[PDB]
């Protein structure tokens, strides 16, 4: 066993080892291992991505115009965000500027995804960590109605409704086929909601499962289908025609009307169902405002997103701010430059890849994806792992750092950056939220805070959807219809050799695609994805990533039941296919 110090933590792998493999209620494949001391406190945490596909290798030799379609399939949960980063990167490389409406529509596509993804995460992925579903069977329907009505204007709150939901659950379980609820953690002492709040949350789980399907109708209008809508280098293929013959074959007034209808319903559901539920989880689980801080009080990172000035990726354009904080100095939001070789680097000394020198990091324009499955001296064998060896290579995830620092990304990171840059709406939202919970601002730097910020961001994105829609309609009223720039569509118009960066803020954090084009073909295509940051293995200095840090120092009530581990990991919304690509 060994012990060392990093980032204020004592990493100690003595004592009992716990394994959670598979991690469920995430996208894709993850394994987590911890060590716990005699006090049932985690003293070591190990984050392992247990899948790899190799998109960066598959993209070599492809036409840059096709790249978006391939990389969109990195992930079907954050569907679309990789396409957006791709078209951005290729346009950056070639020197293509899209028409305003294309940019507005892309901003709509991204806001749509934020709303949808955040909603499903809250209910279907994280929700059951907080809501004791079987305890809902004990609630009183009238007290459930009274609770819901005290928290929200949302219409669906009758005692009869809550009774009907409760009876549906009762019937579901009556035949002993508990399905997704089988062998859960129900009754664990960390479940703190009263029965009525459990029934309210479970009713909302069901309402959200239904309602999420509607949100992505916006993607279907502009992008053809969801999951995995379509895009183009140069703008979007959804040509617009409002007032001319053949508008039936284009985005017309009836199609735009459908979009507006979905926006309003999306805002209403988020504001009157998701938001009050997030606050209620807060009210009943205040101790979790001091659990799972990890790196969120030390180092956080945002690239920024939603350029409002078409083709301007600067600070005056991005509606979702970018910046980096290190060393816990939130007074110093530092600018991020994705071309600077000293900023974003990835290490593989603790990952299943080959580098010429694994003791240094490589900027993505110098990235290498040469897979090498070498788990070394595990307990067990290379095809039957009982315990990973975290002193050597233990993941399919590369280790990104920013100027050598280990960073947290995602909704909490973004919230902190925007707050500390003085974004008025963010400051007001956070202050109001923490005031309602009677918690200090520091309470956001936590597992609970990650969930609160995610809900906040869904409301933020819903409002931005209306803003972008209105901007599109303003253009159309002015006769500005263009959706594509095609003067550099043909490969002969491109530079013989060029490179570009496409970046955005995906639901889970900072996303970047780095592309090099040579002789009409992709020469290099490297992705660094938000869960790559958060789920990162260690680096040559032994520095731990955001998941391992947030799990450090966590108390477990029952070692064999990983509820606390799941709560913290799920709070980051892990997307393992993203992380590994």
């Amino acid at each position: 066993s060994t012990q060392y110090e990093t980032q204020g933590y004592t990493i100690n792998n003595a004592g009992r080892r716990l394994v959670v493999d598979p991690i469920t209620r995430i996208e894709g494949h993850m394994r987590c291992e911890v060590n716990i001391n005699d006090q049932n406190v985690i003293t070591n945490a190990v984050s392992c991505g247990t899948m790899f596909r190799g998109l960066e290798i598959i993209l070599q030799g492809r036409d840059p115009r096709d790249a978006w379609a391939f990389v969109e399939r990195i992930c079907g949960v954050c569907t679309g965000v990789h396409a957006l980063a791709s078209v951005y990167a290729i346009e950056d490389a070639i020197g293509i500027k899209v028409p305003d409406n294309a940019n507005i529509i892309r901003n709509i596509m991204l806001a749509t995804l934020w709303c949808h993804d955040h909603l499903v995460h809250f209910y279907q992925l994280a929700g059951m960590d907080w809501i004791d579903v079987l305890d809902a069977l004990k609630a009183d329907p009238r007290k459930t109605s009274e609770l819901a009505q005290s928290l929200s204007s949302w219409p669906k709150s009758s005692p009869g409704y809550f009774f009907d939901v409760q009876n549906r659950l009762k019937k579901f379980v009556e035949g002993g086929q508990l399905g997704i609820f089988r062998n859960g953690y129900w009754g664990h002492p960390q479940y703190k909601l009263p029965p009525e709040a459990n029934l309210m949350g479970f009713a909302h789980y069901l309402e959200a499962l239904d309602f999420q399907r509607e949100i992505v109708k916006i993607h279907a209008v502009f992008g053809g289908k969801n999951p995995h809508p379509n895009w183009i280098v140069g703008g979007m293929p959804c040509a617009i025609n409002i007032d001319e013959s053949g508008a039936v074959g284009a985005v017309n007034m009836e199609r735009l009307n459908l979009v507006q209808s979905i926006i309003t319903r999306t805002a209403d559901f988020i504001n009157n169902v998701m938001i009050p539920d997030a606050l209620a989880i807060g009210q009943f689980n205040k101790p979790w405002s001091e659990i799972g801080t990890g790196l969120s009080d030390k180092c956080v990172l945002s690239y920024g997103a939603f350029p409002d000035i078409a083709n301007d990726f600067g600070e005056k354009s991005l509606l979702m701010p970018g910046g980096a904080v290190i060393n816990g100095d939130f007074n110093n939001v530092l600018p991020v430059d994705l071309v600077d070789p000293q900023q974003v680097q990835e290490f593989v000394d603790h990952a299943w890849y080959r580098y010429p020198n694994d003791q240094v990091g490589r900027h993505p324009f110098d990235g290498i994806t040469d897979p090498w499955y070498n788990p070394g001296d595990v307990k067990g064998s290379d095809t039957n792992i009982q315990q990973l060896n975290e002193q050597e290579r233990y993941s399919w995830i590369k280790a990104p750092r920013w100027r050598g620092n280990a960073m947290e990304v995602g909704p909490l990171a973004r919230t902190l950056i925007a707050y500390h840059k003085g974004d008025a709406a963010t400051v007001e939202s956070v202050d109001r939220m923490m005031s309602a919970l009677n918690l200090p601002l520091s309470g956001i730097q936590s597992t609970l805070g990650r969930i609160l910020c995610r809900a906040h961001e869904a409301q933020w994105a819903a409002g931005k959807l209306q803003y972008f829609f209105d901007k599109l309609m303003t253009n159309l009223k002015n006769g500005n219809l263009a959706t594509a720039s095609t003067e550099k569509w043909e490969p002969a118009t491109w530079p013989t050799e060029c490179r570009g960066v496409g970046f955005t803020e995906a639901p889970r954090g900072a996303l970047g695609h780095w592309a090099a084009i040579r002789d009409g073909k992709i020469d290099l295509y490297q992705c660094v994805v938000p869960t790559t940051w958060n789920a990162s293995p260690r680096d040559p200095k032994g520095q731990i990533g955001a998941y391992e840090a947030a799990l450090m120092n966590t108390k477990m009530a029952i070692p064999e039941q990983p509820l606390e581990i799941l709560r913290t990991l799920h709070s980051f919304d892990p997307c393992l296919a993203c992380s590994t690509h």
């Binding site: 598959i58 035949g175 289908k225 809508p229 979007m236 095809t383």
Partner: protein, 263 residues
């Protein structure tokens, strides 16, 4: 009355097929889960993790041996002894084989499970391999697409439950009901194709009138799916209707048939 047990496993995947399924408008996925099937194992949605998830897996495939439908999303990689996709510290393929052995029938959701999809595109770093090249002794219903249409996925399930039968399939194992005809055989832009009325560059006058996307690379003439009839997301659209040619995403090898923008 008991509901039909379903075990849903995941190999190398992007989770687009699960996401599509939960979009279902009729029946709602909520009602599928609560009333039409017993979704007894599913990494994306289940409460249990780790050892508790393993116990579910084992209990269901044992107690319902011979009686559950196995749905597979994603595929097994043969490279690196299978450890490009690890579950419970072992190659995914071992879980696939164990689950397959007890299944009454297997549904290969998506182009991943059916054919390979994006990870099997050149140069296929992981040796990602479709289910029917690993499991050779069980009925496999291929439901391709990246992902398949939400209401196609749920109609297939309702068919199986209501009619107590597998759907009839073509020679490739695809349900005839939704994969018997080509995109181009039911495309609302066919008039334009027939008249030589084509988009030639994005957002040209042709594009603004909904002309055919053949010269922009549309692969609908060689792709079997229901997108031009059933459409997507409760009938709201499909790729062509929103101005992008079909990529061919329901067909074996569609990633490596050349640029999406070329003939």
């Amino acid at each position: 009355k008991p509901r039909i047990p379903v075990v849903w496993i995941h190999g190398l995947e992007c989770t687009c097929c699960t996401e599509s399924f939960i979009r279902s408008a009729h029946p709602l996925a909520k009602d599928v889960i609560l009333s039409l099937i017993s979704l007894d194992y599913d990494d994306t949605l289940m409460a249990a993790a780790g050892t508790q998830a393993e116990e579910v897996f084992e209990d269901i495939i044992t107690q319902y041996n011979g009686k559950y439908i196995l749905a597979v999303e994603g595929n097994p990689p043969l490279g690196e002894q299978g450890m490009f996709c690890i579950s419970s510290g072992r190659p995914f393929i071992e879980k696939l084989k164990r689950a397959a052995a007890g299944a009454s029938a297997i549904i290969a959701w998506g182009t991943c499970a059916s054919w390979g999809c994006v990870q099997a595109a050149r140069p296929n770093p992981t040796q990602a391999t479709p289910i029917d090249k690993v499991i050779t002794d069980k009925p496999i219903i291929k439901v391709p697409g990246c992902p398949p249409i939400p209401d196609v996925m749920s109609a297939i399930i309702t068919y199986m439950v209501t009619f107590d039968r597998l759907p009839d399939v073509d020679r490739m194992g695809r349900p005839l009901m939704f994969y018997g005809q080509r995109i181009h055989d039911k495309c609302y832009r066919r008039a334009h194709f027939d008249a030589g009325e084509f988009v030639q560059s994005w957002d040209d006058d042709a594009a603004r009138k909904g002309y055919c996307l053949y010269k922009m690379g549309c692969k609908g003439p060689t792709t079997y799916n229901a997108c031009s009839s059933t459409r997507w997301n409760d009938g709201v659209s499909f790729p062509i209707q929103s101005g992008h040619g079909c990529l061919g995403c329901a067909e074996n090898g569609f990633w490596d048939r050349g640029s999406f923008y070329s003939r």
